[PDB]
Amino acid sequence: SPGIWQLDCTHLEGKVILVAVHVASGYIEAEVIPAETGQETAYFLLKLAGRWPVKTVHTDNGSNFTSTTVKAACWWAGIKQEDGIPYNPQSQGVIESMNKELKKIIGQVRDQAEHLKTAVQMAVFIHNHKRKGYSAGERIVDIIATDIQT
Amino acid sequence: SPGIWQLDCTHLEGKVILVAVHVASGYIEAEVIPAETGQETAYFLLKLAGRWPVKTVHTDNGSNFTSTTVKAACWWAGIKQEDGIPYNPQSQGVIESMNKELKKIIGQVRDQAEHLKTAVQMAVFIHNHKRKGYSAGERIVDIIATDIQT
Ligand SMILES: C=CC[N@H+](Cc1ccccc1C(=O)N[C@H](C)CC)Cc1ccc2c(c1C(=O)O)OC[C@H](CCC(=O)O)O2
Ligand SMILES: C=CC[N@H+](Cc1ccccc1C(=O)N[C@H](C)CC)Cc1ccc2c(c1C(=O)O)OC[C@H](CCC(=O)O)O2
Ligand SMILES: [Cl-]
Ligand SMILES: [Cl-]
């Protein structure tokens, strides 16, 4: 559980926002990319795994699951690449609501930056710091610290 | 000191590697940029502060300290922007040693990627995961979790 992440790809302004969600905490990292490719996804996961102890990634679609570029990055970073089939039907709902929230926040900050990438990073910040009480940033650190003491 | 970070700029292959070091743990995040500008630095700090609870940044030089772009990002993200004067002379030595280590790791992986940015992310991964025994990635989580319980 401490090491499980889910990939999520959403669209805004003709661009693609790639999101990784730490499933247990709801903490996120995100980036804006021109299009989802294997190379973009592979690079994103490499960054993520250097920053948090990523054990398992539930990939966002079959193309990223298949991609030998993505598989090579997961091999390098010691990540178990898994499908993202929503065996628990609540998964679809949670991701959809997260995408909606993120787009809402992006609109609220959209005027405080020229470029979408900036607005997306502002949205990451607001999402991770929002107390709902603890924040997602607090939950992820608490979860992993609890794990390290095991 | 759970919230204290230090900026560090180093050069390789005609490009600039911007590094943020979590002082208490030695955990790092890094990116390759064409040149250090206020905009590049501001965006880097915005990303960092959305991902970790960044209270204070010791800036790497007077230009970034002065930059109104950098000050605006620090204001946005709730970061106290401070100078990076090495009042403790050991800090110069520590940063220089980190730069040398990072460049060594980049050399060791340089063949496993076409692009320097990839190699730098691999270096971040190796640095953060290396047990010295705990890793820097373990130390930062433990430090912050301890703080949250305060
Ligand atoms: C066709 C894939 C390209 N590479 C193949 C490669 C080339 C040479 C040696 C090893 C490997 C190799 O498979 N390496 C190991 C096993 C896995 C990391 C790896 C790679 C992936 C994503 C990137 C990269 C790079 C790069 O080669 O540096 O460069 C930046 C780019 C930025 C995002 C974007 O622009 O899409 O993301
Ligand atoms: C001259 C600065 C430009 N901006 C001024 C600005 C313009 C319009 C509205 C508000 C603000 C403003 O001051 N905003 C708040 C108060 C602080 C975020 C902010 C900004 C900084 C770094 C970036 C940006 C952007 C951007 O405008 O989106 O875009 C991506 C770029 C990528 C790194 C690179 O390419 O150097 O880093
Ligand atoms: Cl946070
Ligand atoms: Cl780690």
Angstrom distances, CA of residue B1 to CA of B24, B56, B106: 7, 9, 29
The number of beta carbons lying within 10 Å of the beta carbon of residue A118 is: 21
Helix H or strand E segment including A50: helix A38-51
The pocket around ligand 2, CB under 6 angstroms, is made up of A 112-115, 117-118; B 37, 39-40, 42-43, 69, 72-73, 76
Instruction: Give the Å distance between the CA of A6 and the centre of ligand 3.
Output: 19
Cα–Cα distances in Å, from B88 out to A104, B84, B85, B91, B94?
45, 10, 8, 6, 11
Going from N- to C-terminal start, the domains of chain B cover: 1-150
Nearest-angstrom CA–CA distance, B101 and A136: 33
Instruction: Enumerate residues 6+ apart whose C-beta is below 8 A from B131.
Output: none
Burial state string for B99-130 with b = 16 or more CB within 10 A and e = fewer than 16: beebbebbeebbeebeebbbbbbbbbbbbbbe
Q: Which residues of B13-50 are buried (b: 16+ CB within 10 A; e: fewer)?
A: eeebbbbbbbbbbbbbbbbbbeebbbebbbbbbbbbbb
Task: Using an 8 Å CB-CB cutoff, list residues of chain A that contact chain B.
Answer: 29, 43, 46-47, 49-53, 76-77, 112, 117-118, 121-122, 124-125, 128-129, 137-138, 141-142, 144-146, 148
- The Cα-based distances of A2 to A43, A56, B35, B51 in angstroms read 22, 10, 37, 16
Q: Which of A146, A150, A136 is nearest to A28 (CA)?
A: A136
Residues of B in contact with A29 (CB under 8 A): 51
**CA pair distance A138, A25, nearest whole angstrom:** 8
Ligand 1 probe mutation, A15, A36, A43, A64, most atoms within 8 A of CB: A43
Is B127:B139 a contact under the CB 8 Å cutoff?
Answer: no
Torsion of CA B48, B95, B27, B36, to 10 degrees: 20
- Determine the residue type at B37: T
Asked if A11 contacts A17 with a C-beta cutoff of 8 angstroms, the reply is yes
Question: Is the sign of the CA dihedral B95, B18, A128, A19 positive or negative?
Answer: negative
Instruction: List helix spans (H) across A67-112.
Output: 68-77, 90-109
CATH number of this structure's domain A1-150: 3.30.420.10
Judge whether A144 and A54 are in contact, CB under 8 Å: no
Beta bridge pairs of residue A28: A21
Confirm if A122 and A17 have CB atoms less than 8 A apart.
no
Rounded to the nearest angstrom, the minimum Cα separation between B73 and chain A is 10
Backbone angles phi, psi at A3, to 5 degrees: -105, 10
Q: How far is the centre of ligand 3, averaged over its atoms, from the C-alpha of B14 (Å)?
A: 33
Is the C-beta atom of A56 inside 6 A of ligand 1? no
Residue with tokens 């208490």: B24
CA distance A128 to A136: 5
Ligand located closest to B125 CA: 4
CA angle A12, A18, A22 (to 5 degrees): 130
Q: What angle do the packed helices B68-77 and B38-51 form, to 10 degrees?
A: 10
CA A53/CA A69 separation, integer angstroms: 21
Spatial separation of the C-alpha atoms in residues B112 and A37, rounded to whole Å: 19
The experimental technique behind this entry is: X-ray
Give ion ligand 3 contacts, CB < 5 A.
A 128, 137; B 53
Q: What's the full length of chain A, in residues?
A: 150
Chain Cα centroid distance, residue A42: 13
B122 CB within 6 A, ligand 1 = no
The token duo for A88 is 């628990």
- The conformation of residue B24, written as its DSSP 8-state character, comes to T
Is B137 in Cβ contact with A53 (below 8 Å)? yes
